[PDB]
Design a protein around this nucleic acid. Structure first.
Ligand SMILES: [Mg+2]
Ligand SMILES: [Mg+2]
Ligand SMILES: [Mg+2]
Ligand SMILES: [Mg+2]
Ligand SMILES: [Mg+2]
Ligand SMILES: [Mg+2]
Ligand SMILES: [Mg+2]
Ligand SMILES: [Mg+2]
Ligand SMILES: [Mg+2]
Ligand SMILES: [Mg+2]
Ligand SMILES: [Mg+2]
Ligand SMILES: [Mg+2]
Ligand SMILES: [Mg+2]
Ligand SMILES: [Mg+2]
Ligand SMILES: [Mg+2]
Ligand SMILES: [Mg+2]
Ligand SMILES: [Mg+2]
Ligand SMILES: [Mg+2]
Ligand SMILES: [Zn+2]
Lengths: 22, 233, 251, 56
RNA sequence: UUUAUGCAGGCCACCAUCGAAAGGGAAUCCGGUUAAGAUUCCGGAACCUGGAUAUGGAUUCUUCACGGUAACGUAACUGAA
RNA sequence: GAUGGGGUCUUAUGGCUGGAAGAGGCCAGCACCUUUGCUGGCUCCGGUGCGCUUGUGACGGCCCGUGAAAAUCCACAGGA
RNA sequence: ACUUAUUCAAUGAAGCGGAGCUGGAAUUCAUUUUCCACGUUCUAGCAUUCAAGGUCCCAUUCGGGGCUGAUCCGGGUUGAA
């Protein structure tokens, strides 16, 4: 882990900024 | 300016990690690169018999430029111009019934190995250009001696690809002017007066000289270091 | 007749060396640039025991000069090397116990070990416990050093060859009796299947040249020609002499 | 066990020092001391080897 | 953000695969239940992995926490190659 | 840098609480073709040990024997 | 004797050869013949982000690029035989 964990972290942050873009 | 500092790194032997340098001298190349380099190395480490390196004295770039400028005036007809030519000749034999002679007589450079060899044997060639990079060299090693025997002038020139672009091919490996127009026959004469001096008149002395036998850089430095070692007096 | 035991040894089915508990091949550092133009410093992190080997090993850590990383070489530990010690390997290295100076840069009488035959094979000579190579002399012209080997032989190797300064640790091992087939068993159990050994004279003639007879006896002479063939070389191969060695051997 | 360290927080796996969960406190102390001391020694070696051959 | 995923880049040099139902290894227990099944079904109570994610809490105007001399502590208290 | 005085930590393990008494167990009484139940109580407090088995810890002995590897997971340095 | 055939060995083919700087010795018999060097040795630390700096451009801005830092030339990876 820590690698898929970092990738999940960046995926969640990218989804958060992409949905708050609007 | 007061926030920056000069670190400079000690790139000594045990001091710091070396920077990225140009390691092109130490690249492990593929075998095709290695063979295509070591082949030309081996072709000069050996004493080549004079029939080879009767090549390797090529035409200088000025005379090569002017002779290709001459040869480009006499270029074989491409497919499109040949097609409109033959349609014109069909129309001409339809209207006038001319014996396929409405089209004028061609003036084109003759090419193809067997073709120009037969032309040389029949003494119809006025000037022959022989490419220097033929990969079986035995396709053309006999051509200079044959040209000297038949008395036709030859020139060993750089680029079978250049001859190929001259005759609308990829490579041609040989070219020959067999009949020129009166507008530049004098240019052909002043050109051949230097070409024969470069090749034909130097033929019986290049026939005796063995080329090759050239050492590498490290071995050359080693032998001349031994020379200036023996030069104590 | 059958295929005899020493003839079977070369197939390497059950006669391979048991290499499960070995730390790796104990080689010298590669002669890259630093070792032949200056020196480089490593550190002995741990001195460990190697299975099937009488001499202890030393895990020396160097820095890679071209990439940011750490390289770990396995040296054979010389007698006196301790943990935390700085090992200096190179042409400009100082003459101390544990350093890997080339043999061209050491004076006569220097005691070295793990010596290269040709520069770049990373240690071939004097690697057993307690052994060492003496430097007899140099030849600057025709750059060769003459050395005395543990066998008493005198070799002439390149002065660019390297060697660890000192004596291989673990010396005096064979001065202790094993006292026991069990101890010999446990010694060979981690080297290879070469123990116990049945005498060929106690076998049958299908099994050995010496086998057979109503008494245990060899029969023919036990000295075998060097030009003999496999299956015949059972005995003293190409013996120049035999019997008890009295007097000096005229070495 | 090594997989269980993925479930606990950072407090259970570290202390609040440099080389926290990696090195001992005394080991951190002695390597700090070694760093500072021999960098000072490197400075004084630099200035003395400079000034000797600057004079000569 | 014609848009697909090329071109922008950047990192990386192991270098197939098979090989343990006793080696290594993420995580489950109790009670009950059938003619014959159970750490597998029923009831209750948990745990791990993977993925989505919002709220609370924590932290910040001294931007990425404080306390303890210290060993260290805590609910958290960015960290790529 | 002992003993001593004061603290820090690993939580194997053990204790209390939750889980959880509602479960399970032991009894009593009331019952009825019957599915058969239903209703009550009690389930508490200790002690011992060169004991047996097993796990673990700190040690000590033995070796020319020093007694697997990888996957996997975490942490640290660094400062993008 | 040579090296290019052949053969041996290593490396993630990284520093080969020649010349040149900058120092030391060097005797120079005119002006320099050469020869040695040409960043690391009390200490179980650290050393990585095309490298900081200097300099020159861009169009300044968020930065970007070149040279030097780190001497040139030969592309023979390096030896042995
Ligand atoms: Mg055996
Ligand atoms: Mg026996
Ligand atoms: Mg018998
Ligand atoms: Mg027999
Ligand atoms: Mg017999
Ligand atoms: Mg008998
Ligand atoms: Mg902690
Ligand atoms: Mg498998
Ligand atoms: Mg398994
Ligand atoms: Mg298992
Ligand atoms: Mg195991
Ligand atoms: Mg059953
Ligand atoms: Mg269930
Ligand atoms: Mg807090
Ligand atoms: Mg105390
Ligand atoms: Mg527990
Ligand atoms: Mg048992
Ligand atoms: Mg190499
Ligand atoms: Zn420690």
């Amino acid at each position: 882990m820590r690698a898929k964990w970092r990738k999940k972290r960046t995926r969640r942050l990218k989804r958060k900024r992409r949905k708050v873009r609007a | 300016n007061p926030l920056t500092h000069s670190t400079p790194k000690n790139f000594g032997i045990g001091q710091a990690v070396q920077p990225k340098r140009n390691l092109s001298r130490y690249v492990k190349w593929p075998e095709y690169v290695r063979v295509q380099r070591q082949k030309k190395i081996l072709s000069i480490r050996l004493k080549v018999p004079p029939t080879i390196a009767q090549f390797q004295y090529t035409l200088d770039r000025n005379t090569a430029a002017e002779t290709f400028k001459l040869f480009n005036k006499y270029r074989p007809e491409t497919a499109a111009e040949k097609k409109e030519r033959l349609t014109k000749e069909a129309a001409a034999v339809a209207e006038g019934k001319s014996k396929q002679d409405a089209s004028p007589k061609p003036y084109a450079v003759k090419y193809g190995l067997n073709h120009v060899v037969a032309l040389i044997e029949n003494k119809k060639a006025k000037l022959v250009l022989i490419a220097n990079d033929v990969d079986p060299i035995e396709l053309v090693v006999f051509l200079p001696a044959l040209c000297k025997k038949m008395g036709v002038p030859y020139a060993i020139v750089k680029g079978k690809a250049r001859l190929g672009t001259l005759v609308n091919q990829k490579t041609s490996a040989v070219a020959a002017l067999t009949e020129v127009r009166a507008e530049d026959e004098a240019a052909l004469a002043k050109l051949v007066s230097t070409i024969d001096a470069n090749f034909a008149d130097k033929y019986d002395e290049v026939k005796k000289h063995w080329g090759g036998g050239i050492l590498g850089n490290k071995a050359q430095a080693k032998m001349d270091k031994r020379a200036k070692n023996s030069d104590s007096a | 007749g059958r295929v005899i035991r020493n003839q079977r040894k070369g197939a390497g089915s059950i006669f391979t060396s048991h290499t499960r508990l070995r730390q790796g091949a104990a080689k010298l550092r590669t002669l890259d640039y630093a070792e032949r133009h200056g020196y480089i410093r490593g550190i002995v992190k741990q001195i460990v025991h190697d299975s099937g080997r009488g001499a202890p090993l030393a895990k020396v850590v160097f820095r890679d000069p071209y990439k940011y990383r750490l390289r770990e070489e396995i040296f054979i530990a010389n007698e006196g090397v301790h943990t935390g010690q700085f090992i200096y390997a190179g042409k400009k290295a100082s003459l101390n116990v544990g350093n890997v100076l080339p043999l061209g840069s050491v004076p006569e009488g220097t005691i070295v070990s793990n010596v290269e035959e040709k520069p770049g094979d990373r240690g071939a000579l004097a690697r057993a416990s307690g052994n060492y190579v003496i430097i007899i002399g140099h030849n600057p012209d025709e750059n060769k050093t003459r050395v005395r080997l543990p066998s008493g032989a005198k070799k002439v190797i390149s002065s660019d060859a390297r060697g660890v300064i000192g004596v291989i640790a673990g010396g005096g091992r064979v001065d202790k009796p094993l006292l026991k087939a069990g101890r010999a068993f446990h010694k060979y159990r981690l080297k290879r299947n070469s123990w116990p050994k049945t005498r060929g004279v106690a076998m049958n003639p299908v099994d050995h040249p010496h086998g057979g007879g109503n008494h245990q006896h060899i029969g023919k002479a036990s000295t075998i020609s060097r030009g003999a063939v496999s299956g015949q070389k059972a005995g003293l191969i190409a013996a120049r002499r035999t019997g008890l060695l009295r007097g000096s051997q005229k070495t | 066990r090594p997989r269980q360290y993925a479930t606990v927080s950072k407090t259970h796996k570290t202390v609040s020092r440099a080389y926290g969960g990696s090195r001992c406190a005394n080991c951190v102390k002695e390597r700090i001391i070694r760093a500072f001391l021999i960098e000072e020694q490197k400075i004084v070696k630099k200035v003395v080897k400079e000034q000797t051959e600057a004079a000569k």
